[PDB]
Design a binder for this molecule. Sequence first.
Ligand SMILES: *[C@@]1(O)C(=O)N(Cc2ccccc2OCC)c2ccc(Br)cc21
Ligand SMILES: *[C@@]1(O)C(=O)N(Cc2ccccc2OCC)c2ccc(Br)cc21
Lengths: 304, 304
Amino acid sequence: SGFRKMAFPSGKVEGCMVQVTCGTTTLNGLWLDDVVYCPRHVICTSEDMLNPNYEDLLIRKSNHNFLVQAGNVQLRVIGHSMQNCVLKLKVDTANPKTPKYKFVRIQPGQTFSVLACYNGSPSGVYQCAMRPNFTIKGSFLNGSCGSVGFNIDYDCVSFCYMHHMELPTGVHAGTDLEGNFYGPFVDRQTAQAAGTDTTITVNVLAWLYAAVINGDRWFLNRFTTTLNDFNLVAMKYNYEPLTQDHVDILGPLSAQTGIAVLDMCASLKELLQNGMNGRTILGSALLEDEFTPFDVVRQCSGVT
Amino acid sequence: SGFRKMAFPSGKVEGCMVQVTCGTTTLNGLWLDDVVYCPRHVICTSEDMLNPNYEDLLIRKSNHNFLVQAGNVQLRVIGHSMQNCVLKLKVDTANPKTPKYKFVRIQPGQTFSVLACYNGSPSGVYQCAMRPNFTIKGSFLNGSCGSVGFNIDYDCVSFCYMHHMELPTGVHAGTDLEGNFYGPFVDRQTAQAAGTDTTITVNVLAWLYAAVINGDRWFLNRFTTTLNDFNLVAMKYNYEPLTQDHVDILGPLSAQTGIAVLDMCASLKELLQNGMNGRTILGSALLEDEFTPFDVVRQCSGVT
Ligand SMILES: *[C@@]1(O)C(=O)N(Cc2ccccc2OCC)c2ccc(Br)cc21
Ligand SMILES: *[C@@]1(O)C(=O)N(Cc2ccccc2OCC)c2ccc(Br)cc21
């Protein structure tokens, strides 16, 4: 027992991290097979970021201007291309440490692990969730661009995120591994505000199921509710509307605990209306929304 | 910016995880050089755990009874010995993936990363702290014994913890890598209650410094206090007494923010006396005590 914000073991991803330098700019690259992926703004000076024309800026760059270093060995760059907001540097050597992998574009509400890197070297690993306004509440300092988000299914790494920007609000924006930004952000030093950060309702319910499994039961009540009734409360507290798809994904958790999804919704409803009255749930004094129903099943069953 | 409960990149530790089986019991082992470390209760049946005599139980075990599997390859066991509560299985092959390493016995209040494993395979990684009552609030299910805690200084892995037990309260007990339990616990299925879980005061202050650095400033007040005055409040709220050593370790954080340690103590004091009034600090609605002053400096500077 016990429930923790757990990240995936990052070894498979650490083996892909490289450093990319173009002129005076250094960031992280992801080396998979004979290709290094990195944010296209590696070609920018801090001056260029106000209003860059990446196609024009790229015309001035040749293969030899992209210095790619894997630990202490230098990769030979034999090609470069821009796909959306990422650069693809074809190197002459396949990364011998390339794990089985996929590139996936995740939905808001989904969680992933971030291996924060600086100059091609990993600093740490933490769990994240793509917020409903398509930002992530990360921990990134200058030089962290190029760090990636991922999930792992047994031996396959699904890369979902690549870090590109920090909003003036201290929240983070980035792309999937095809270079497309999540949400409306652009790789430009401009005023970009994020939308409402709503709470991921399905994740809070799943975390309430994790809490009942681990002994925190005080919040369980004598009530029930309906999808429409619950959603009126969810709307008042800027929570995502719960759908029958969400009820369905919560099925296994409902099955193992014997607490019907709508009964848990009524516990959540009372907690929204009354707060926690100085109490805690799984060591938290707020309703945690960055564990999906899959993460809870995975942690509560011991999947490796 | 942004502040997260970050774990160390676990790749170096994943390369050491092996599976150990003795009879019907399977747990995790740590393979470093030509030695596999694992909890000695691998030799026990669930029946033996009520009152085991490990020396007697071990007399019945030979090298060939300890099955050690690294991924899918079988290690040949050429020796076995019991050091305190750990077994040391000498294998005929040095682990080619052994990183630079040390064995350290940490103090209460110190933090470390746990690579939770099942059958020699990593499931996830999370940050922990050795509680002042020498327990850890982990996430461990059956088969997680043998999973290790560690810190990393550049390329050197300092192993500090090895998981052995779950208390009837759902908290966790284990040893350092010499087999000595932290706190008074024994590897036996008996009533073992933990002492008072006090809050690690120096870590809360360090986390308040991390919050000021990242923009959460609302809790800063017009007051100051003294070590003795603050400690009267700390005693009332079961917080660890703050010492001049703690004030000293907080020096760099005090220096970079310009907020004197005793002024931060007065912010902490008001927060203890008044609560957070529905507000949050670094996305938490409680005072976080599992970031040491070193963890905060490391995260706020980008150490790799
Ligand atoms: C990341 O390492 C990086 O390249 N970078 C610079 C950057 C990125 C987006 C917009 C502007 C800009 O530079 C302004 C001069 C950056 C910024 C913040 C973070 Br958290 C990481 C990185
Ligand atoms: C760990 O995998 C393990 O071996 N184990 C069994 C155990 C450990 C301590 C006391 C008793 C006992 O078995 C009782 C039958 C165990 C128990 C709990 C956890 Br979280 C991990 C492990």
